[PDB]
Structure formats: C-alpha cells, structure tokens
C-alpha cells in the first residue's frame, strides 16, 4: 500500500476516524452568555 | 484627544556584520558515495531541534514536515535579501544545507536492478522547527508580511511568528488542554489501550497524542 | 399479541394506548419534579423476591 | 426493549430471572402440581454450581489469608526466640 | 509492528473522585469479580483469545465469578476491553448448605440467598 | 546494476542458552558469543 508518510493525507482506519471524532476538543460553555449579564 | 503611549525603543539590539542570508549550496562539498534509505521518520512528528529563538525576535515556523531543496533555499534567500533592510534587520538560517541524498532511477525504467544514482540533496524539516530567524531594530508587522510571503511558498504549512506570538500560541494550547470539557482524550485511550485501540493506532501515537498524522500536524487536535 | 388486540380487540387496544399515554405523561412530570410527592400512580413498579 | 428494567434491577431481557420465566407453566385441573420444566431444572443446576463455586473461592481466599497470618506470626515468634540467647561476659567487668 | 500492550500502573489507581463515582470502598475491597464477555475475540489477537478461554468467558453475556487477586487481575487486564467487571456483593451471607439450591445471581451483582417467586 | 554482492549469510543462532536461575549440568554451554559480551 502506502508508506507511513505520504503526500495525500492518507485516509485513516474507520476505528481511528471514530476515535478522533469522539476525542475532539470541547470548549467550556458558561451558564449565561458573558455579554448578557451586566 | 487621543491618549498616546511611548514607542518601544531599540537601544539594546545590535545588528551583526553580514546581515543578509548566506548562500546555500545545493550539494555538500564532499559528496556522499554511499546511498542511504528513505528514512521517512525525519519529517514525522515534532521537531526536537531549532525549536526556540536564539538571537532574533521573529522567525518562520514550520507547521508540518517536509524536505527543503535548493529551489526552496534560493527562493527564500532571494526574497528575504531583496525585501529586508540591511541597516535595521538581519536574517540567519536555522536549517542546514541540503545533505540527505535523494536518488532516482532513469526515466522509462522497469523495477529492479539495484538502487538509482544519487540525483539531488534535501534538508528534512519537522513541524515546530524555526527555519529562518530575524532580528534587529524593527517591529514585527513588516517582517511578518514579507515572511508570510515566503512561508506560503514552502513545501509544508508554515507561519511567520515572533517571540510573543509563539509564546501566546503555546499558552493557548496549554489552556485548551486544561479546559477541554470532554472526558475522553486520545492520550488516555491510547495509553490505556481502551477498546483495544492499539490494533489501529501506531507505536508512535503514544507520543504523538493524535496531534500528528504522517507529515501533517493538527494544531487544533488537543 | 399487541397486533392481535389492535385488530380484534380495539377497545382493549385503546385502553392500552391510554395507559401508555398516562405513563408517558407521568414520566414527563417525574422528569420535571423528581417525584415529590407521589412519583406517579401507574409508576411504582411491583417488587419480587 | 428494557434498559429501564436494569435500573429496576430486573434482567433487561424479560425472559430470565423472574416469575414470568421461573413459574410453572401449568398444573393439573384437580390441583396436583406439574413436574418441573426442563429449562427450569437446568437453570437450577447451573445456579447451584455457581453458588458452590462462589463459596469455594471465598473459602480458599480466607484460608490463604489465615495461612499468611500464621506464617507471619510463626516467623516473628521464631526470630524473637532467636533473639534471646545472650550470655555476655567479655565486657561484663 | 503490532505487539502486546503493557499498561502503566497509574491507570489502575483510583482517585477519591472515582470512589465517589462508583460505590467501591478502598478499604475492605470486594473478594470476588463477576466478569461477563461483551465483545467477540474475532479480529483480536490469539493471546487475547487464549486469555478469554482461560478465564472461561467463551460464551458471551454469561457471568463468571473470579477472585480479586493480582494474578487473575493481570489476566483480566490483558482482555479488559472485551469484558465487564463488577463486584460480587452478598446482601445476606454466603450461601449455606440448605439454601444452596434456591439462589439467584440477581443482576446489579446481588447474589440473593433466598429466591421466591412472589411479590413483596 | 546491483554492484553489491555477497551478503547472504544466515544467523549464527548465538546467545544465551541457559538464563538466570536455570539448573545446569556440567559441560552444558551457557552462552555462545563472539566479541566477548
Ligand atoms: Mg546479513
Ligand atoms: Mg538468510
Ligand atoms: Zn446581550
């Protein structure tokens, strides 16, 4: 197949794709938007 | 009235002699007779060398792996030397001259019959390595413009950075890491072999933490 | 048997649907009020030992 | 189906571990109970084997703990008895 | 190359937050595990297949009782991604001789000593 | 065209024969080596 290093982003195994989709960064969400409160 | 602030003074920065970029030769003075394999690992993962400023305050930072060859070297050196100010800015290399020999077989050749003759030389570069550094009694905006110009023409992703810019990026990366709100981390799962994920992952992923894919680096990956 | 009753005992099936709707409303009220007090009447599962 | 059954602690599959499965299907019309069903007999045998294994494992763990405690006590007593053999006279006077 | 994976021991060190999340008491831990296979050994390495065979979890969703001792714990750590581990709790005492016949595992892990079929 | 030839030797199967704690009889080879290790 391909080498471990390539020029075309080398689409991943579906398990790895699910892992990356599940381990994404989630920013914190304040209870009330900062602009609304005084 | 508009309030005014003191200008950042430059009384503690001295430009060195020969402020322009040194010529870079395509091939080493002593050519390598023995041909080496394509150890593609020298562009994989984060850079362990030339990651921090030494004398200047601005630089070109690589955000991905790749090979620099003589055309790239000439492009960056010519653009920098024709776009900088010798009396107030100095530029210094941070990548060695091309030393890795790339061999190619003759055109229209079938597979087999030994390796090919050495054709040219390249400089491997990893993500996170400074390629050219800049210093002097100048602000960042002009150098940022005409250095992003050069960085857009590199074989990999690149940016124009400063000391404060790079420090800010690193602190924001740490802040994102600590305030990440989901409880499932690539590092945790990979190191604990959760779900048996090591059958899909790589032995390098334990240290790459999911932030590196081949010669590509994801700065938003956490 | 649910389809059997739906075809041949429509009264019984209407009673079953009414009971399911009552339980659904009780579940909504429970999700609103955490019980407090009666946690519903067609709730209160029967325990076995 | 039922996952709420698990929250009630009731065998998410309603076809095991409950009266609907373990009660006799039928009995004679005059009142005499029916012979036990084959699935119920097999489930009873498996349950007995599981309980006996639980008892055996617990007893083996307790015996191992007691043996370790006894070994530690015996070693301590033997070393303490080794301690007291002193008849010093070289630096007595 | 794909190899066996050794897990750092810092993974198997619970925090007070974990002791609050789950009902386990770090003092007087549970004697016995209930282990249940919930994932096939197909597309898994032969050593994991063998470990499942040794642990006796060849049949999926069938509970098996094991000791809470380091040897079997390492055995379970090898295949921890294919199984479910719960503590075995005894509401009453251990099964006696005259109550050994009428028992039930009674999921949530409570091995009940008396098993009637009547409502409370 | 493949100027290199010759390097086709098999492994010598050299190393430790009896490891630490192994019971050994007189004359048994413990380890076969070159370039003392
Ligand atoms: Mg050889
Ligand atoms: Mg050979
Ligand atoms: Zn607002």
Overview of this protein structure:
The structure is cut from a larger assembly and holds chains A (38 residues), B (222 residues), C (49 residues), D (93 residues), E (120 residues) and F (37 residues). By secondary structure, chain A is an all-alpha fold. Chain A is 24% helix and 0% strand. Chain A is elongated, with a radius of gyration of 19 Å. Chain D has 93 residues and is mainly alpha-helical. Helices cover 58% and strands 0% of the residues of chain D. Chain D starts with a helix and ends in a 10-residue tail after the last helix. Chain E has one domain (1-117). In chain E, 21% of the residues lie in helices and 12% in strands. Chains in contact: A-B, B-E, B-F, C-D, C-E, D-E. The interface between C and E is small, with 4 and 8 residues. One magnesium ion binds at residues 7, 9 of chain F. Chain B: It comes from Homo sapiens. Chain B: Belongs to the universal ribosomal protein uL16 family. Chain B: This is Large ribosomal subunit protein uL16m. Chain B: GO terms for molecular function: rRNA binding; structural constituent of ribosome.
Overall morphology of chain E: globular
What is the element string of chain E, with H for helices and E for strands?
Answer: HEHEHE
Bound molecules: magnesium ion, zinc ion
CA distance, first residue to last residue of chain E: 59 Å
Q: Rounded to an integer, what's the Rg of chain A over CA atoms?
A: 19 Å
Global structural class of chain A:
mainly alpha
Q: How many runs of DSSP E, i.e. beta strands of chain A?
A: 0
Largest sheet of chain E: 3 strands, antiparallel
PDB class: ribosome/antibiotic
Keywords: Mitochondrial ribosome, Oxazolidinone, RIBOSOME-ANTIBIOTIC complex
Entry title: Human 39S mitoribosome in complex with antibiotic Linezolid
Chain A: 39S ribosomal protein L10, mitochondrial
The gist of it:
Chain E: Belongs to the universal ribosomal protein uL30 family. Chain E: Its main location: mitochondrion. The structure is cut from a larger assembly and holds chains A (38 residues), B (222 residues), C (49 residues), D (93 residues), E (120 residues) and F (37 residues). Chain A is mainly α.
Features of the shown structure:
part of a larger assembly; 6 chains; A: 38 residues; mainly alpha; 1 helix; elongated; C: 49 residues; 2 helices; binds magnesium ion; binds zinc ion
List the helices and strands and how they pair.
This is part of a larger assembly, with chains A (38 residues), B (222 residues), C (49 residues), D (93 residues), E (120 residues) and F (37 residues).
Chain A: H1 14-22
Chain C: H1 2-8, H2 10-33
Helix pairs in contact in C: 1-2
Chain D: H1 4-7, H2 19-22, H3 38-83
Bound molecules: magnesium ion (2 copies) and zinc ion (ZN).
Zinc ion binds at residues 35-36 of chain A.
């Amino acid at each position: 197949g391909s080498k471990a290093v390539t020029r075309h982003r080398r689409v991943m195994h579906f398990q790895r794709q699910k892992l990356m989709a599940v381990t994404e960064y989630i920013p914190p969400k304040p209870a009330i938007h900062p602009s609304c409160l005084p | 009235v508009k309030t005014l602030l003191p200008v950042p003074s430059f009384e503690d920065v001295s430009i060195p002699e020969k402020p322009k970029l040194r010529f870079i030769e395509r091939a080493p003075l002593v050519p390598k007779v023995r041909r080496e394999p394509k150890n593609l690992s020298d562009i994989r993962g984060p850079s362990t060398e030339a990651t921090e400023f030494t004398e200047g305050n601005f630089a070109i930072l690589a955000l991905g792996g790749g090979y620099l060859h003589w055309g790239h070297f000439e492009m960056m050196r010519l653009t920098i030397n024709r776009s900088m100010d010798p009396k107030n800015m100095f530029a210094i290399w941070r990548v060695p001259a091309p030393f890795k020999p790339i061999t190619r077989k003759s055109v229209g050749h079938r597979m087999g019959g030994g390796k090919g003759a050495i054709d040219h030389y390249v400089t491997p570069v990893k993500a996170g390595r400074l390629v050219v550094e800049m210093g002097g009694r100048c602000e960042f905006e002009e150098v940022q413009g005409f250095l992003d110009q050069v960085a857009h023409k590199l074989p990999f992703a690149a940016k124009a950075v400063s000391r404060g810019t790079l420090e800010k990026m690193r602190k924001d990366q740490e802040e994102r890491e600590r305030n990440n709100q989901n409880p499932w981390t690539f590092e945790r799962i990979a190191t604990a072999n959760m779900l048996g994920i090591r059958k899909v992952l790589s032995p390098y992923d334990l240290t790459h933490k999911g932030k590196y894919w081949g010669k590509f680096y994801m700065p938003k990956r956490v | 048997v649910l389809a059997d009753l739906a075809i041949y005992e429509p009264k019984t099936f209407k009673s079953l649907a009414a009971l399911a709707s009552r339980r659904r409303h009780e579940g909504f009220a429970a999700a609103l009020g955490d019980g407090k007090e009666p946690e519903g009447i067609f709730s209160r599962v029967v325990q076995y030992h | 189906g039922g996952q709420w059954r698990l929250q009630q602690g009731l065998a998410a599959n309603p076809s095991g571990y409950g009266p609907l499965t373990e009660l006799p299907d039928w009995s004679y019309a005059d009142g005499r109970p029916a012979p036990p069903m084959k699935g119920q007999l097999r489930r009873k045998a498996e349950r007995e084997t599981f309980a006996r294994r639980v008892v055996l494992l617990s007893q083996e763990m307790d015996a191992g703990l007691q043996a370790w405690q006894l070994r530690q006590q015996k070693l301590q007593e033997e070393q303490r008895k080794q301690e007291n053999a002193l008849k010093p006279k070289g630096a007595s006077l | 190359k794909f190899t066996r994976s050794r897990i750092p021991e810092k993974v198997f060190q619970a925090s007070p937050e974990d002791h609050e999340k789950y009902g386990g008491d770090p003092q007087n831990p549970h004697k016995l595990h209930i282990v249940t296979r919930i994932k096939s050994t197909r597309r898994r390495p032969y050593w994991e297949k063998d470990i499942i065979k040794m642990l006796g979890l060849e049949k999926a969703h069938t509970p098996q009782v094991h000791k809470n001792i380091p040897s079997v714990n390492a055995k379970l750590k090898v295949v921890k991604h294919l199984i479910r581990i719960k503590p075995l709790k005894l509401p009453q005492g251990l099964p006696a001789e005259e109550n050994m016949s009428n028992t039930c595992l009674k999921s949530t892990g409570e091995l009940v000593v008396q098993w009637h079929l009547k409502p409370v | 065209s493949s100027k290199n030839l010759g390097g086709k030797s098999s492994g010598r199967r050299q190393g430790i024969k009896k490891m630490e704690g192994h019971y050994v009889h007189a004359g048994n080879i413990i380890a076969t080596q070159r370039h003392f290790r």
